Amino acid sequence: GIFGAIAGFIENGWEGMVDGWYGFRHQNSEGIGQAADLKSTQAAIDQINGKLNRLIGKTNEKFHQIEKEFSEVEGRIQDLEKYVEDTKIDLWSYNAELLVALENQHTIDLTDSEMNKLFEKTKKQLRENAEDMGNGCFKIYHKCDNACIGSIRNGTYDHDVYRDEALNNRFQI
Amino acid sequence: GIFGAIAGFIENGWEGMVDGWYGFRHQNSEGIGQAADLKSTQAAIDQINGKLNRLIGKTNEKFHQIEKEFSEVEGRIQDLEKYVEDTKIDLWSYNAELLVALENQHTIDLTDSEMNKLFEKTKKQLRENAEDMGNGCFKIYHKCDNACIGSIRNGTYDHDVYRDEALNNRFQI
Amino acid sequence: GIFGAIAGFIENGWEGMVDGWYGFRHQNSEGIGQAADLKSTQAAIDQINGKLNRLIGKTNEKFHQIEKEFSEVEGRIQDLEKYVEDTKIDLWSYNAELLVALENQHTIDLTDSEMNKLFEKTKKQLRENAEDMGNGCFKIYHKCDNACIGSIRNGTYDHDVYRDEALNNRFQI
Amino acid sequence: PGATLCLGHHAVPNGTIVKTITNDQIEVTNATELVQSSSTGEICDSPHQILDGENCTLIDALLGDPQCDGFQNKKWDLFVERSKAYSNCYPYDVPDYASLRSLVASSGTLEFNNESFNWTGVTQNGTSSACIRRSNNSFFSRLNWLTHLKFKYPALNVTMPNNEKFDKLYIWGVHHPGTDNDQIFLYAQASGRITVSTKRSQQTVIPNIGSRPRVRNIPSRISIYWTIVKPGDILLINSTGNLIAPRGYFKIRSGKSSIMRSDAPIGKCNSECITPNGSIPNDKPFQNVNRITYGACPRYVKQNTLKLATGMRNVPE
Amino acid sequence: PGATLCLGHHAVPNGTIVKTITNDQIEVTNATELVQSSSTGEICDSPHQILDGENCTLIDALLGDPQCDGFQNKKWDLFVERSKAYSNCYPYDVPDYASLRSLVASSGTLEFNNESFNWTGVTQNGTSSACIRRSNNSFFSRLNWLTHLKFKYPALNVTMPNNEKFDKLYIWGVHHPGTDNDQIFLYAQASGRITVSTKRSQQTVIPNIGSRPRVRNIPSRISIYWTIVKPGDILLINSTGNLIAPRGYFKIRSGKSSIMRSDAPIGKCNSECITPNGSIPNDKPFQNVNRITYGACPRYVKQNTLKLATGMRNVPE
Amino acid sequence: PGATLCLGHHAVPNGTIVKTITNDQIEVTNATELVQSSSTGEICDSPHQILDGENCTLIDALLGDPQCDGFQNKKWDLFVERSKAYSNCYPYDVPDYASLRSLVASSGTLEFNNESFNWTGVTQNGTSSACIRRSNNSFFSRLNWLTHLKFKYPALNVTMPNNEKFDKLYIWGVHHPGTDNDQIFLYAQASGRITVSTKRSQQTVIPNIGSRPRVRNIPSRISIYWTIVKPGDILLINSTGNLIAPRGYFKIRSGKSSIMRSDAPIGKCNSECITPNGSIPNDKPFQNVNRITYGACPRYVKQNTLKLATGMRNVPE
Ligand SMILES: CC(=O)N[C@@H]1[C@@H](O)[C@H](O[C@@H]2O[C@H](CO)[C@H](O)[C@H](O[C@@H]3O[C@H](CO)[C@@H](O[C@@H]4O[C@H](CO[C@]5(C(=O)O)C[C@H](O)[C@@H](NC(C)=O)[C@H]([C@H](O)[C@H](O)CO)O5)[C@H](O)[C@H](O)[C@H]4O)[C@H](O)[C@H]3NC(C)=O)[C@H]2O)[C@@H](CO)O[C@H]1O
Ligand SMILES: CC(=O)N[C@@H]1[C@@H](O)[C@H](O[C@@H]2O[C@H](CO)[C@H](O)[C@H](O[C@@H]3O[C@H](CO)[C@@H](O[C@@H]4O[C@H](CO[C@]5(C(=O)O)C[C@H](O)[C@@H](NC(C)=O)[C@H]([C@H](O)[C@H](O)CO)O5)[C@H](O)[C@H](O)[C@H]4O)[C@H](O)[C@H]3NC(C)=O)[C@H]2O)[C@@H](CO)O[C@H]1O
Ligand SMILES: CC(=O)N[C@@H]1[C@@H](O)[C@H](O[C@@H]2O[C@H](CO)[C@H](O)[C@H](O[C@@H]3O[C@H](CO)[C@@H](O[C@@H]4O[C@H](CO[C@]5(C(=O)O)C[C@H](O)[C@@H](NC(C)=O)[C@H]([C@H](O)[C@H](O)CO)O5)[C@H](O)[C@H](O)[C@H]4O)[C@H](O)[C@H]3NC(C)=O)[C@H]2O)[C@@H](CO)O[C@H]1O
Ligand SMILES: *[C@@H]1O[C@H](CO)[C@@H](O[C@@H]2O[C@H](CO)[C@@H](O[C@@H]3O[C@H](CO[C@H]4O[C@H](CO)[C@@H](O)[C@H](O)[C@@H]4O)[C@@H](O)[C@H](O[C@H]4O[C@H](CO)[C@@H](O)[C@H](O)[C@@H]4O)[C@@H]3O)[C@H](O)[C@H]2NC(C)=O)[C@H](O)[C@H]1NC(C)=O
Ligand SMILES: *[C@@H]1O[C@H](CO)[C@@H](O[C@@H]2O[C@H](CO)[C@@H](O[C@@H]3O[C@H](CO[C@H]4O[C@H](CO)[C@@H](O)[C@H](O)[C@@H]4O)[C@@H](O)[C@H](O[C@H]4O[C@H](CO)[C@@H](O)[C@H](O)[C@@H]4O)[C@@H]3O)[C@H](O)[C@H]2NC(C)=O)[C@H](O)[C@H]1NC(C)=O
Ligand SMILES: *[C@@H]1O[C@H](CO)[C@@H](O[C@@H]2O[C@H](CO)[C@@H](O[C@@H]3O[C@H](CO[C@H]4O[C@H](CO)[C@@H](O)[C@H](O)[C@@H]4O)[C@@H](O)[C@H](O[C@H]4O[C@H](CO)[C@@H](O)[C@H](O)[C@@H]4O)[C@@H]3O)[C@H](O)[C@H]2NC(C)=O)[C@H](O)[C@H]1NC(C)=O
Ligand SMILES: *[C@@H]1O[C@H](CO)[C@@H](O[C@@H]2O[C@H](CO)[C@@H](O[C@@H]3O[C@H](CO)[C@@H](O)[C@H](O)[C@@H]3O)[C@H](O)[C@H]2NC(C)=O)[C@H](O)[C@H]1NC(C)=O
Ligand SMILES: *[C@@H]1O[C@H](CO)[C@@H](O[C@@H]2O[C@H](CO)[C@@H](O[C@@H]3O[C@H](CO)[C@@H](O)[C@H](O)[C@@H]3O)[C@H](O)[C@H]2NC(C)=O)[C@H](O)[C@H]1NC(C)=O
Ligand SMILES: *[C@@H]1O[C@H](CO)[C@@H](O[C@@H]2O[C@H](CO)[C@@H](O[C@@H]3O[C@H](CO)[C@@H](O)[C@H](O)[C@@H]3O)[C@H](O)[C@H]2NC(C)=O)[C@H](O)[C@H]1NC(C)=O
Ligand SMILES: *[C@@H]1O[C@H](CO)[C@@H](O)[C@H](O)[C@H]1NC(C)=O
Ligand SMILES: *[C@@H]1O[C@H](CO)[C@@H](O)[C@H](O)[C@H]1NC(C)=O
Ligand SMILES: *[C@@H]1O[C@H](CO)[C@@H](O)[C@H](O)[C@H]1NC(C)=O
Ligand SMILES: *[C@@H]1O[C@H](CO)[C@@H](O)[C@H](O)[C@H]1NC(C)=O
């Protein structure tokens, strides 16, 4: 949420995108299409897997400890045994609560960050040939067929090829 | 601070804005005015209230515990009682210190984020009709009366209405 | 990493920049040069020193405690002494692990933030006289000698001086 | 001409300093305190059931010291022990005092049931000038000082079954006389031996004759012991002298009761969190009033203030 | 005409609610549970060496109650004590029972070595109807009830050197007879006195004659004691009666062994984490099954669920 | 032509690997270590007052073993006990040894004041060959072995008031003779009984005659006890034999003193943090040298290294 893309300037997500977490939809003279972006998808996945690697399958071995249940009333020593255990459990319970809250805030933020980074990268690539419509969409001011859209998604788009055409379309009356 | 708006490219805050946390000042042919932005204000407030909801009015009930003050010298058992308590208090004191430091860093960052998001939203809305002066202000290159300024603040500004006028003013010699 | 500049749109760092952490390289009619930016460098350093101030030279005094090593087998009281200590050490070990992980994530992010802020500041300063090439470089569309580059780095660049020249170069065919 | 549109944020003339990860002093527009550092100084009598011990320790109220007759059969959530409290009966000690005090505090009741022990062969109801009840020489109300009958103390072998559905707590004692002569004047034979047992447990205590420094002119002492008897078990007392006998049993309950040392006045007010300094509000997550607490309380910390930012960075004009 | 290019992100129809710093309920595309809250209900017999106590407590297996002869010399990682277990030998108690149980549990072995004690002058191998082994009157297998020989019990002053490279654990006891007559019938003189010592330590115990409530028709009791003898030290037993003698020593080891109370069945399966409710998977960092654990276990917490987001915010169409 | 202006950041050829929330290995330009993992191996003699026990345990220095006469009346912040230390006086034990050691360690002083006890009727200053001081048979310097005078040991009933403004610590003992004959040779009557009391407390100890394994050719033992006497209270000692009497009292103070077991040499240097391995620097917040510490020390953790990034991500050319 802190970057402002997911649940922000992108109005909603796409339930029909099932082969990636981030990607591109377009409309041009040949149709309307969708493609996932693998680099951004993998960047978010790698970070989340990094968190999981630090939490799953990581337990601590303990053997003989203290007694934690008691059949008879005893007073001072038993009060201390019970208090040590209750103290420990409350501290671990706090750690668990805070860990999940912090990690989840961070996951929401890092996923929003990856959406924003992809948007910014695309904006810069288009140079003077497009304008940002404010909703995560760019209006591209030149004929941009399927191979042209592909070049944008693959990072091989040469803005100079189309610049004269685009400037003419943008700065007309 | 991490987004760079508050205490960053916005030179300072406005003591005269008392009906919101974020907003707009303008100058046009009809005067100089100020208006709060309620959406951004509420977004920051809601997040801070979310933190408060997780900290205020949330105490833990404890009843019979161990003794923590002693009238006589006893040795081993009393050393252990005292050490358990001192251990507990130092761990809770650490938790409290870190909680406040982390939460405060986050509050400063999330409030800066909301200022940046409002700025970015406004920038995109203005399209080719304005330029960013670098200090959180936009120079709008067309006549923009009170109703026009209102349309920007309400999200109903139609950039196409003014684009020819604006481009003529921007790209003259 | 979360801002997308360092290890992101900036392809790599500069081993030959030894008098600052962030800065500028240029090419113009008089040569290719490098200069550090002191404000951004100091901003990152101050934040990291703030963390260090809260961790280094801050120890807690403890005096008489409990015994932690034992020459003879005793049963219940010794089991409790050992468990209290093992409990304490595991909680402090967890605190240390999490502290370093969180602080390091934050340091990487705050340093990336400072690089991004400097880039954004420079972009805004250049107004309509330059375009972002996508790799942290700007193409400046006017003659910009050493004093002109200096004015950009010192925040005294007057975009109006060069605007007619720049617009002519940008929006030609 | 055109227009200018500026984005901005508020500021205040009276900001507050908070700590962050990177700065120990940064000014924000508003903050809230997370450490409770004050009390009114009164222990509120609601909503916990408070029992002010006044002149009595819990253990004196248990045994039945004459200043504590008003406490019979009372219950509490929190028993409040005052520093001025003193004993004014026969001088005694309790091996493991701390444990008896703790287990009675936690049980939360002085409910006592009399039982008819078969003390055939001895004199009952022995009293002393060290324990005045209404100008008359007296003794602990829950204990029965047995002495010779016609210069005979025949061996006691007395039983009491627990046919209840709950546990019974028996409080009893051994009299240590100050002299060999006192042993004879009271019990008609040389130093006894007490054995109190059940199917599950056994305790034997040896009286030790000798002078202790005088307390209310008494060089003798009583040592107090206790025994818990489970349902379907049986108390057996076996003695040839020096037995300070039980008159019955205490109910032993489990729950949320405790005990606290404090000189704070009890007030007619409502507060969930009790400390020895008085009740404290419990809105805040932390407190630095006292490590000793009872009820729904903030957690004790060493810091006297921790400010949580509730606004943005303050950047005045 | 030109083109439109839109950037976006996925969403799912079935999102999951997680907690964050600023919101207690936010929907994400996917999450994973961090608290293990279930068991199958069986204690897996692998990879830890499990010893099911069946009818026997550890202490009954130690002393050698007749139901526990199958346990001789066995080792364990985890000894499992069942709630149905009961004693069926001579009635005894252990001052400090909890500590003896703990130290044997931790040692992880019942390895016992017989030694030839010089009991010249007394009758050995005393037995009782309260301890039946194969319809015959019997006694604890690891203990030796000494009585008079021809109405003489001469003073015992018996030594046993530790010339091993390890520590020796000796278990011994004192017989408390029910009557003065029983004292005479067994030991031929008035109440004894036992002193067990080494160069480093000493313990003296006094038999206390008297009636306790009958258990398997026995009003007498045995009290159990223990002594650890270091290499090059020497056990010395000094008694004039009432000695329940050791027959040898237990090895005392150090390692990872323990004891647990549970009624869970032992299963033929493999699990690293044991609780009294059964084994649990240990993939998750936390668990709310039981605070009592053995092995590589998740840490016990109070929460029954903690969901970790593994996807972005879910923003459905 | 125009110009190009590029924004960038530094990098280094020799980066360092750190851990983060999302990556266990990321290279940064610089880092600093947060775990202290080394010591020089010396305990610095400043700024804490160090007392090297040399051949003496604290308890031997207290009682007055002949190797420890140099320790009289000394104070410490930290008493250092060496593994080579051994006792070389009359063989003794201390029930609760750990507690006496702890309370004296914490008090931080061996300040002793002699008092004139009225021991009329007995022989004082008994000595032994098991406790040599300057080739002569001797005894613990702070204890007074009382024996018969002209084959009489009349009952002792000796008092000592505390008219000071501080508490007094009395150390005393009971002699357990090896044989019935030794009892007679020393005390002229059958086995005694000791009762040490105040207005607040009482302790009675029974000598137990019998052979223990010989230590420096002594089959007898002394058992050590202690009593704290508050201002305006009175010590009363009541015995008919076997008393190892106090010669006076120790002052008992409160403060920051303690005791540590270590074989590290004491060095002429200055360090605030002491461990058994030696002093350690205390700049870092954590340490993995030893869980045992004294002074201003980093907190013990299990990790041997924790690197804190002090620079940006390193992205080499
Ligand atoms: C016909 C005939 O010949 N009969 C014989 C009897 O003479 C004889 O009885 C005994 O006679 C002697 C005198 O030779 C003496 O009077 C015996 O009574 C004791 O008296 C002493 C000295 O006065 C007294 O000691 C003093 O005690 C007080 C305080 O006293 C109380 C108390 O605590 O308030 C009084 C209580 O009633 C008593 N409690 C009970 C249950 O009896 C207690 C208790 O004795 C003590 O607390 C235990 O330490 O004492 C004060 O402490 C003074 O400082 C102290 O000097 C004793 O208290 C008296 N003892 C009793 C039991 O009353 C008297 O028995 C008989 C027995 O040999 O033999 C007949 O044949
Ligand atoms: C020639 C001559 O004149 N010889 C003399 C002998 O008469 C005399 O021997 C004694 O004689 C008396 C009768 O006057 C009596 O028979 C003595 O034996 C005891 O008998 C009582 C009464 O029956 C008995 O008490 C009962 O005990 C049972 C259970 O008994 C066992 C058990 O636990 O199973 C039997 C065990 O073998 C025994 N253990 C050992 C090691 O001996 C134990 C043990 O005695 C108890 O557990 C200790 O409490 O008891 C049940 O408890 C009943 O309720 C109870 O009434 C005693 O158990 C018998 N004691 C013994 C040692 O056998 C008999 O000794 C001799 C001695 O004065 O003198 C000669 O000169
Ligand atoms: C005129 C007349 O007829 N007078 C009678 C006296 O004869 C008689 O005196 C007693 O006589 C017998 C002999 O029949 C014997 O000598 C008594 O003295 C004991 O002797 C034994 C045997 O030698 C001895 O035991 C040995 O002790 C040593 C070590 O000894 C010391 C020590 O620890 O160094 C010496 C110390 O001075 C002593 N301490 C004190 C305060 O006296 C201690 C202490 O006795 C022990 O530590 C306690 O265990 O011992 C070593 O341990 C050997 O292995 C061991 O055999 C005793 O130590 C001697 N006891 C004493 C008190 O000196 C002698 O008393 C008199 C009494 O019946 O009656 C007259 O009528
Ligand atoms: C600086 O930042 C803080 C924190 O955000 C603000 O403090 C909050 O201010 C609001 C508005 O005044 C408070 O709201 C009121 O709460 C009362 C409960 O007070 C007690 O209980 C809580 C917890 O149980 C304690 O934390 C607190 O200290 C008190 O002991 C209610 O009784 C009030 O109700 C009244 O007003 C509402 C209006 O809708 C009506 O519904 C009712 O009829 C009634 O009349 C009210 O809801 C809130 O408690 C404060 N929070 C904290 C943590 O202190 C500051 O306002 C802010 N300062 C500035 C200048 O902005
Ligand atoms: C929502 O988010 C979660 C977490 O990211 C995803 O859950 C993971 O899903 C993957 C793919 O199904 C799982 O990968 C598999 O792990 C198995 C191990 O399972 C046990 O062990 C772990 C820890 O020890 C436990 O956490 C787990 O619950 C099990 O008890 C492997 O055996 C699997 O191997 C098989 O497939 C691979 C394919 O490469 C082959 O190499 C093998 O031959 C074999 O056939 C597999 O690797 C992973 O365990 C899950 N993690 C967790 C924490 O649950 C969800 O998939 C995701 N949901 C959606 C809709 O995206
Ligand atoms: C990688 O990152 C680390 C951490 O930021 C840098 O380490 C710091 O480096 C500076 C400069 O060298 C150090 O500053 C010096 O500190 C000395 C104190 O040293 C001891 O005390 C501290 C804590 O009490 C310990 O952490 C430390 O290890 C030592 O035991 C001062 O004595 C020095 O003073 C001298 O120089 C100053 C210059 O202004 C003068 O005022 C004095 O006259 C005097 O001559 C100096 O201040 C700092 O201690 C280091 N911090 C840590 C935590 O190690 C690395 O420099 C950096 N590496 C690179 C390549 O950038
Ligand atoms: C053993 O010694 C102690 C201590 O000296 C003796 O106790 C003391 O005994 C005297 C004489 O009985 C007590 O005197 C009494 O004092 C009270 C109170 O002021 C007074 O009212 C009486 O008139 C009487 O004089 C003294 O208090 C007491 N001291 C202490 C400290 O208890 C004890 O009697 C001796 N025991 C034996 C058996 O000899
Ligand atoms: C002291 O009092 C106790 C309790 O009254 C006495 O114990 C009781 O003694 C009787 C008589 O021996 C026991 O009776 C026996 O019961 C068994 C079991 O049912 C039965 O098989 C026998 O036939 C016999 O009647 C009774 O069980 C026992 N009660 C308890 C609670 O142990 C004790 O004997 C007295 N001691 C002395 C020395 O007087
Ligand atoms: C009870 O049995 C113990 C153990 O057998 C007896 O202790 C032993 O007594 C003998 C004879 O006095 C001691 O011999 C002495 O050894 C020393 C040191 O080498 C030597 O210098 C003497 O010449 C003498 O021969 C032996 O050390 C001692 N053993 C132990 C382990 O203490 C004890 O005397 C018996 N007690 C009674 C009252 O019978
Ligand atoms: C600033 O002043 C107002 C009005 O007097 C007050 O309500 C508010 O709490 C103050 N804020 C701070 C941060 O002190
Ligand atoms: C227990 O009571 C019996 C029977 O009255 C008696 O023989 C015995 O002496 C008593 N025991 C004690 C220790 O008082
Ligand atoms: C110890 O044994 C000796 C020698 O046989 C004997 O004199 C003494 O009475 C025994 N002591 C005890 C307490 O049984
Ligand atoms: C205590 O001293 C008195 C008076 O001298 C005496 O009668 C008594 O026997 C002594 N008590 C003991 C246990 O030594």
From TrEMBL, chains A, B, C:
Disulfide pairings: 144-148
**What are the annotated glycosylation sites?**
154
UniProt-annotated location(s):
Host apical cell membrane; Virion membrane
Quaternary structure and interacting proteins, as annotated: Homotrimer of disulfide-linked HA1-HA2.
Physiological role? Binds to sialic acid-containing receptors on the cell surface, bringing about the attachment of the virus particle to the cell. This attachment induces virion internalization of about two third of the virus particles through clathrin-dependent endocytosis and about one third through a clathrin- and caveolin-independent pathway. Plays a major role in the determination of host range restriction and virulence. Class I viral fusion protein.
Entry's family note: Belongs to the influenza viruses hemagglutinin family.
- Name of the protein this chain belongs to: Hemagglutinin
Q: Which organism is it from?
A: Influenza A virus (A/Brisbane/10/2007(H3N2))
Q: Which residues of the full protein are shown?
A: 330 to 502 of 548
